Design a protein around this ligand. Sequence first.
Ligand code: CUA
Ligand code: CUA
Ligand code: NA
Ligand code: NA
Ligand SMILES: [Zn+2]
Ligand SMILES: [Zn+2]
Lengths: 566, 581
Amino acid sequence: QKIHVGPGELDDYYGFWSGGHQGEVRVLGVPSMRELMRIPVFNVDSATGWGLTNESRHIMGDSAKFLNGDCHHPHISMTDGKYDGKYLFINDKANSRVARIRLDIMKCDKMITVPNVQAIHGLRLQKVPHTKYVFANAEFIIPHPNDGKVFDLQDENSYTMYNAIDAETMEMAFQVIVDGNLDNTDADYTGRFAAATCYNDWVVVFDIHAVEAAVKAGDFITLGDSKTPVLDGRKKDGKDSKFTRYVPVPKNPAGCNTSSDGKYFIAAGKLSPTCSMIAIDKLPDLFAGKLADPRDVIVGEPELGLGPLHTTFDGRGNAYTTLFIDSQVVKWNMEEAVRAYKGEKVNYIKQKLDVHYQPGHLHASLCETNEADGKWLVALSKFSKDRFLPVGPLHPENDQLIDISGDEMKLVHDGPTFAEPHDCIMARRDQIKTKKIWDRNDPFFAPTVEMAKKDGINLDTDNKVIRDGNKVRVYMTSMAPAFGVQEFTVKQGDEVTVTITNIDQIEDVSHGFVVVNHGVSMEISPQQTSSITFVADKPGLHWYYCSWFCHALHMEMVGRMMVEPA
Amino acid sequence: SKQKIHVGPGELDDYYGFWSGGHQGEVRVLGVPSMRELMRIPVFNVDSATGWGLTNESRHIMGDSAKFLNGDCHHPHISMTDGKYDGKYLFINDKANSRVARIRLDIMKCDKMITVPNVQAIHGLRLQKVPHTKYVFANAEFIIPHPNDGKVFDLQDENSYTMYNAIDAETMEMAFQVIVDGNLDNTDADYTGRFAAATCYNGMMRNERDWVVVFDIHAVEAAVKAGDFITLGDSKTPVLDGRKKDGKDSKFTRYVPVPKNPAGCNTSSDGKYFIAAGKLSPTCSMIAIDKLPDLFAGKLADPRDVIVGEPELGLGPLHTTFDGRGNAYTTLFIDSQVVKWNMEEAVRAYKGEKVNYIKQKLDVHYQPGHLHASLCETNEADGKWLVALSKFSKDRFLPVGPLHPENDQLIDISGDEMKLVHDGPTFAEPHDCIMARRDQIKTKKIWDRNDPFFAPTVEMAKKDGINLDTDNKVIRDGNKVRVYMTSMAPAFGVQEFTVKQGDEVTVTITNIDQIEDVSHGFVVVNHGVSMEISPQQTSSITFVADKPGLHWYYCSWFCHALHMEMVGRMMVEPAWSHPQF
Ligand code: CUA
Ligand code: CUA
Ligand code: NA
Ligand code: NA
Ligand SMILES: [Zn+2]
Ligand SMILES: [Zn+2]
C-alpha cells in the first residue's frame, strides 16, 4: 500500500493533529505525514495574527487574555455516523475551553469557556443522527461554589461534571454532575447513549434522552452565574439517578472507544491488562431496571498485555489497542473475545507489533464512523528515544504510521511531532471541501463589516481614514503589490485600528500587514477583511509592510504611519 | 559515495536543517533528507508548550521586547571558525520588531536577543566567516529620520537614512553601525574578515542607482578605535558614515554598480566572489573579492572593474548557492526554475568568449525565492543536497483553504543532473534555511545546573536562602509569594500551597530527574500559565492569583506512567477575609 507520495502526487487522506501543549491544530497529508497547514486556536500566531486581530479576539472572548492552551482530542462532525466535513472540535485542558474549527476555511470560528469546571480533557462527538452535541469531560473535582470558603474536595458539593455543548451554536446545552473523575468519552450510533471512563472503577453511561427530557421539563438547577441546565448524575444513598448508570470496570480505566459496528463501548484497562467490552444493546435494559447487576452489560474482557490505553477499529471486526508498558499495538478480534468471555477456548489475539516507544492513543482511518476502512493506523508514542536525531533536552513524539490494509500490520513511517499532539483524526480527501477564496459575507469577519457599516465604509472599495477623538480607524483595500492607503498621520497616544480588505481574486495571493516595532502582524487572504488595533505610542515615522510574499515586487508593498508628538 | 534519499523507520537523517519560522517567528529543526520537523525553538513567538514568552527566564532574555508576541524571520545562519561551521550558535533576524536573536545549539534554545537601536526592520543577516564569527552583520531595511522624534518626516532629509549593523556575536551587544546610501537588501561576508557586502538600491535620477556596497571592516574598526565616530540618541553604539559625499567615497564603503534592484548577495564557497542576484535584471553580477583591496586603494579606474562576470541566466534571479565543485545554483522567480551554471565559465564569457556556462534549468513549483546547498556557506560545501524555497505551492499539495503552504523542494545535486526528490510544505513562509552535517551539531540531553539560561533565577533564589536542588518551600513577602519546589516524576515537590487573592505568585520548579527525556510541565488551570522543565533545568513563572478558591495545577508533558497523578492545588483565600486596600 501507497506509503510514498512523490513530487506532484497528492495525499489520499487529511490528518488533523492536536497541537498538544502548543495549543494549535495541524493539518497533515496522509500517508506522506507532511504538515500542510497550522490552524491557530489557543496559541497566539504571529503569522496570521490570531490572538492579535480583532476578529480572532472576538471569537476568543475574554479568554483572549490567555496565550496558552493544552490540546489532546481532535474530532470531526458526523451525519448519520459518517464524517460530514463541517467542523472539527478540540479541547483545552489548560483554560477549560472547547474550540470549533470550520473545515471549509480551516480556521477556528467559535470558542467557549466551559462554566463552573476545571480542565477540559476527554472530548468526543455525537454520531447519530448527527453531531448535535459535543461531549466534553472536565477532569478535576472542585468545590461548588469555588469562592474560597470551602476547599474540601470531599465536601458534598465538590465534584466535576460531564459537559454537553451545542455543536452548531457553541453554547452550553447541559452539564451532568458525576461521581469521580472523568477520563475519556465516546458516543453510540443512535444518539441515546454516551459513556465515559471515570477514576476514583467504572464506565459511567449517560441516557442522553433522559437528560434531554429533564431539560425540556425544567427539572434542573443552575450553578453560579451560568444559565446552563445542571443535572445530578451522582448516586445518592446507593440509588441511581435517571441519567446515569455506573458499570464497574478494572482498573483506573483509560480510553473509551465505540466500535465502528456500534456494538461496544470498549474501555481500556490501564492497570488491568485487559479491555472491558460493554454491550450497547444491553444498555436500555440496564436503565429500565431489567438487569440484575450492572456488570451484566459486560460481554467481553480480553487479556491483551501490559498497559492497555486506547482502542481503534478496522471495520473488519478487529480492534487495535495500544499497550503502553509492553510498547506495542495488539490486534484482536472482538467477537472472538466475546465468545472467550463465555468460556469458549478461542484465541482472539491476531498480532502484536512493536512501537517506539510507550504508545498512548492510536487512530485508524475512519474509525469513528460506520465507514471505518481499515487502511491506515497511527500510534502516537510518548518516548521517541533514538528514533530521531537528538535535538537537545526536549524530544518529539513519535507518531508511527502503520499499514493495516492486510492481515499483517506493517510499520511504514516514524513521524516526529512537537509538544505531544497526543491524538489525531483522519478523513478521506473527498470528505473535506475547502474554499479557495473567502466569501465576502463570511461570519468570521461579520462584526468587522458591521463596524465598517457604522462608519459609512464600503470595504470592497474604500480607502479612508476616520477620526473619532483619540481613535483612528483606517480602512483600506489591498491588491498586490500596493496597499490602498500608503500613508496616514495620527497623534501620539491615538488608538489606531487598521482594517484591510484583500480585493485580489487570484487564489493563494495572501497579503500581510506588519507595523514595525509595534508588535502588530496579521494576514489577509483573498476576499478576506482583517483588522487590528494598537496604540501609536511612539512619535515619528513608522513603516508598515506586507509580510507575505505576494508578487515579484513584494518589497514595495509598504506604507508609512506618521505620529505627531504629544 | 551514493547518498541516502529516503529515511525509513529506525534510520536517522544525515543532516540537521535549521528553518526560519517565517512570519510565525520561531526556528525549526528538521532532519534532512527526510524533511521531517524534529523540534521547534521559540524565538520571537510565544510558545504555549515550553512557556517561552511567559516564563521569567525567557522574558529576561527578551528584555523590553517581551511585550511583543510576534516576529518575522527570514535568514538563519550558523557560527563559523576558519570558514567552517563550529556548531556553537545560530542567529536569525526579526524584521517586524527590529531584532537579532542567538540560539545556543547545545540546548536548542534562544539564549540572547537584541533590539538594534535607531533602525527599523532587520532583514538581511549573515555571519563573519574568518577567522571566526566575531560579528553578526544585519541590514536595516527602511530609511527613517534621525532623530525620529516626529519633527521631521521627510525621507530625503540629510539625516534620513538606514544603517548596516554589526553585532558582537559572543556578547550580543552592538559593535558598530555604518550609514549607507539607499535601502539594504541582503548581505554576506568574505573568507578573510576584511570585507562584507550588501545589495542596496536607490542628475535627479541617474541610470546607476543599484549597487552592491562593500564594507572595509578593517577601516571601520580603525575608526572606532581612533574615536572617529558619532552616536545617535541614547545608544553608545559607534556610528560611521559610509555614504558618498558629492562623489567622494568614505573610507568605509565602495558602491559597485549592479543591476537592477539586486536581491541575493552570496559569497562563493571558494572565497572568490560576492555574487549578487539581478532580480529585475536577468543576470547575476560577480564581484572579484581579490580585487577589493585594489578598489579601496584607488588602483582601479572604475568600481565596475571589480565585476568579472555577469551571466545572463533567466527571468527574476533572486538567490545563489554553491556545490563546492565550481557550480553556482540560482533561483529564477519568474521563470520558476533553479539554474545550474559554472562560475569560471561565466567569467570567461564576460571576457567575450563564447562558452555555455549554463548547465541545466530545473523546473520548481512555484516562484522560488532563496535556495540553500548543504554546507554552501563554508569552504566545506559538499555538493550533496539543495533546498529551493518556493512561494506559491498551488496544486502541489491537498487544498487547505485560502492560505497555502510554502513549497520547500529537496533536490539531489550530488551528480551532474539535478533531481527533484521531495516537496516539503511549510508554514508561514520560512523563506530560507541552513543545513549542517549531523557531526557538526552536539546537543545536551541533561542541563548543567550552572547554565546561564537560568542563572539569574538561581541568584534570585539565593537571596531567599534557597538551595534549588533540594528545597520545597513557600516564601512569603508582602503580597508576593515565591514557591520553590523540586520535581521528580511523577510528583511535584510542593503539592498544595495557600495564598491571598491578589497575591503575585512566582512558581520556580527544578526538575531533579537525571534521566534523559523526562520532561515535566506546569500548568495552572484557568490562569494562562504553562511551562516546560527538562531534566536538571530550573524554570519559573509569575502570575496573579486573581480568583478565590481552589485552583488545580498539573504536569502537562508526559513524564512517567503515573503522569496523570502529577498534580497539585493552589488555594486562594478570598480578598474579603484579608485587609482591604
Ligand atoms: Cu503583499 Cu508581499
Ligand atoms: Cu511530570 Cu507528566
Ligand atoms: Na464563544
Ligand atoms: Na539582550
Ligand atoms: Zn487522551
Ligand atoms: Zn531573504
